[PDB]
Design a protein around this nucleic acid. Sequence first.
RNA 1: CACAAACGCGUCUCAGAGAUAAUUAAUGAUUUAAUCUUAACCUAAUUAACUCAUAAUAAAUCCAGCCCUAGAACAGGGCACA
Lengths: 99, 177, 162, 266, 38, 42, 40, 71, 38
Amino acid sequence: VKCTRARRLKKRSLRTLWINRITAASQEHGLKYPAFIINLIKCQVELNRKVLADLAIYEPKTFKSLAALAKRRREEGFAAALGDGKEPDGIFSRVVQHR
Amino acid sequence: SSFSKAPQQWATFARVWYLLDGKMQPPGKLAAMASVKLQGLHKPVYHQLSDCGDHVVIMNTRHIAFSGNKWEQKVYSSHTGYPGGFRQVTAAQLHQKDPVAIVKLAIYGMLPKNLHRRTMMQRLHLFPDEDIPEDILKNLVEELPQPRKVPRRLDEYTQEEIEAFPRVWSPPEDYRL
Amino acid sequence: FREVVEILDGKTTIIEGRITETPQESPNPPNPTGQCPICRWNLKHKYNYEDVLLLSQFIRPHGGMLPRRITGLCQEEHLKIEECVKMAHRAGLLPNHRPKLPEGFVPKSKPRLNRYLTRWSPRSVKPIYNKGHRWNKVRMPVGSPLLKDNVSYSGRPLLLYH
Amino acid sequence: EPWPIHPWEPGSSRVGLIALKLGMMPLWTKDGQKHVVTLLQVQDCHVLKYTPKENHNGRMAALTVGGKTVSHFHKSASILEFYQELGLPPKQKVKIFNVTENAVIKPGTPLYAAHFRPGQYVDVTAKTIGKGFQGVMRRWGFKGQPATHGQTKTHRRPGAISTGDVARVWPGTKMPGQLGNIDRTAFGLKVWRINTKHNIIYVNGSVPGHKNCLVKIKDSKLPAYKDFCKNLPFPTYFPDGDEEALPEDLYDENVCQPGAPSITFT
Amino acid sequence: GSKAVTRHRRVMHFERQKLMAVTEYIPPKPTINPRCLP
Amino acid sequence: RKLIAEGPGETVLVAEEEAARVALRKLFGFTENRRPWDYSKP
Amino acid sequence: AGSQWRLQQGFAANPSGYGPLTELPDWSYADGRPAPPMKG
Amino acid sequence: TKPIPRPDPVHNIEETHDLVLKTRLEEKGEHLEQGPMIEQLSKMFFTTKHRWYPRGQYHRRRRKPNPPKDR
Amino acid sequence: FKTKGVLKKRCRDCYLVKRRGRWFIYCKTNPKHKQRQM
RNA sequence: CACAAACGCGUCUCAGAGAUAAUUAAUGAUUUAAUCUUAACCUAAUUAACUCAUAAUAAAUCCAGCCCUAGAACAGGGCACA
Ligand SMILES: [Mg+2]
Ligand SMILES: [Mg+2]
Ligand SMILES: [Mg+2]
Ligand SMILES: [Mg+2]
Ligand SMILES: [Mg+2]
Ligand SMILES: [Mg+2]
Ligand SMILES: [Mg+2]
Ligand SMILES: [Mg+2]
Ligand SMILES: [Mg+2]
Ligand SMILES: [Mg+2]
Ligand SMILES: [Mg+2]
Ligand SMILES: [Mg+2]
Ligand SMILES: [Zn+2]
Ligand SMILES: [Zn+2]
């Protein structure tokens, strides 16, 4: 019974571990986890927590590139909200459709 | 990148000594980042079973600051086990008795309630003032930024800034101060 | 600014008033149409205990507050600044706005404990020995409730009791 | 090679001795009262080692004093090496006295019972008479149960030990155990007589411990008797410093001497 | 089981408490305080 | 004054030896980031 | 997370919803011939 | 960067007999009790005193003789 | 002193002052009017 | 009290500093008077607690046998004067 329950909880435990690692590597770049995740989603970069943790552990430069992209998207969104103008759009804030 | 297995392991799981100034800083905000560093939640290689943990040296403990009236309201309760041996000491009295005790108890509280808490506490060094032994000073890697911005007093303000700040109101000449 | 001068010359007391030069208001305020000082200078919901350059403008040299009929503030802001001045004085700012006592400065006492955002007086609050359980919790109040209308860039409300 | 002798200061403290408790004697006072004195014989007191203030406590230095001589054949190798480097035979009881920095004495210096003068208050530390594993009535003084009113196997039992709701006994519960073999201190014991030839101190009142045991004597630390070391020899008693032999018996101003006119009231 | 009307304020069900908190009155707040507005 | 390689170690001598090994590997082209072996049919 | 942003942009609340990450064939033969279709 | 510190000092060298001087740097040994040794180890490695105590037969028998290894 | 929950002036010479975290009705002419807010 | 000991009914000793709650007054604005101040500055008279000076232990690896005022066993103190 404990084996079945722990098999169910293993996914949650490993997801929490990946989230903790992504945080660690994010505040190591001076960026918070919620902002990093939302700005990575806004860039249509659909990398799950496991892959993000793998990149954080073994690809420091790639993870720093991802953090820089997420941050840049964050200032782009903040500037768009401050300006409140339909015409001014950021470079990385453009949305691409399916093809 | 192209290291041998043993040096790569040592570099990955090496211990780091951090410095933390405690002058005019809240114990909760200091000890929260302290607990983060002791657990190792700042490492992407972190795991509960692994022994990933770094040392933290907190200085200027005697000059700590409490927000609000916590100095007179916050209490610390202990019991010696013997009947009638239940003591409740105010935060001010506890700080006057032992300056280290405040931050020590805050870190102990925010550390996990597992058996590893004692192990990570043994890696914590707290000093009331800027008097750190050389053997520990030679281990420091970096100093973490203060979590709270210390406000300046009136005399600490520069005269050019004082003149730049406008006078909102004009006092009358007939009034006496 | 007026000053009372007393001269003692052979069983004779001379009390005289002296008028000195006083600084005036800056020429260009952002909002000249406001009658009230802070909320014509556009500082409403902007100042705090950290802001000493604004709190120190209208206070007596001995740390006392100044009358509203002389200052000109609207009542809410007068009360807010009274609370802020009390908070700064208890926190340890405004070091030169203390009375000068040559006798009491030699017998030093216990070091002044650092504090900030303190609401009550340090000598009037009794320590909470029961501290309450989770459902009924006796909080330690931090900061004055009059400062709840200040601008919050983060957007989160200010925790006045913790 | 004596160490420099510093002048006495009001905040200074003095070194003690380690004597041997001989017995008890009566002693009458000039007002007709009868006191009981205990005999403390200073056989062999020597300063063994000196620990500096910062390396011992940070407030006061420590001087180590040895007691009565013992045999070399039953001591350990390290103790024998220490006494070999010191140049003195091994001692039985080795104690530590907390002294001020101005009353330090070179190790290897002997101490004599004339270190205390007639009229003074001393504190006595020793292991009391160990009565072994004793019952609760003799250890804590609890009242027993009635002996013959039907009580069954309960005449000396402690009875209830705790409370039903607590479901446990408190750590401060009084119960039978070891009694006596522990270091106790008696404070404010007046000294009436100092015998110089045999090095004997007559201390008023009872002394904790059996006869012929080693006893640690020091000044009284009571707040009422804090500053009586002014008239007393500050570093210690040096018989060679004065170049004058003290009288055989040093008496107090109230002790009725054995040679007395058989005082009568008027 | 208590009556419909009681003296102890009849501590309320959680969803009704949430409903009351949501439907609490919100006074109209002007942009500028009219006291020392012109 | 140009960094060609770096190496970690428990002691300074071991760290220097590891740095020399890393520089040697970089010079010889045998690096962890090198081209994987070509397994194809020419 | 990020569901409201995707709903505003028109994509599904879940990246698994009708997106190219799931609709496209995730593998094919090295020759280039199409793979057997997916049961889902 | 900073230069590499180098510490090379041999104070055990004797001008009379270097053969004995060489053993003067190798004849250093020390032995302590369990308590003091565990305290010294805990102080040196910044850990607790309970880690260095041994374990029983039940735990020593159940350890895997050939644990799996990756890489 | 009398400890009370509600304080009132029993004469025109009483004055109300906040001290030690409580309210105090102090009277000099009639000392029996001394009231302390509990 | 028919043991060298134990015992009371017999004898000896028993303490300095800080700190406070209630409550008094000095100085002083909001409220240029006054006002002990969930206004500051130093204030002074102040309960019991509670901590701290101070006091006790606080020299590691000889232990076969024999004594002990040391002890259930294990431990601990002695075995050179004589
Ligand atoms: Mg599932
Ligand atoms: Mg016995
Ligand atoms: Mg009886
Ligand atoms: Mg019966
Ligand atoms: Mg019977
Ligand atoms: Mg029966
Ligand atoms: Mg229980
Ligand atoms: Mg019903
Ligand atoms: Mg006045
Ligand atoms: Mg008056
Ligand atoms: Mg103490
Ligand atoms: Mg022995
Ligand atoms: Zn206004
Ligand atoms: Zn009245």
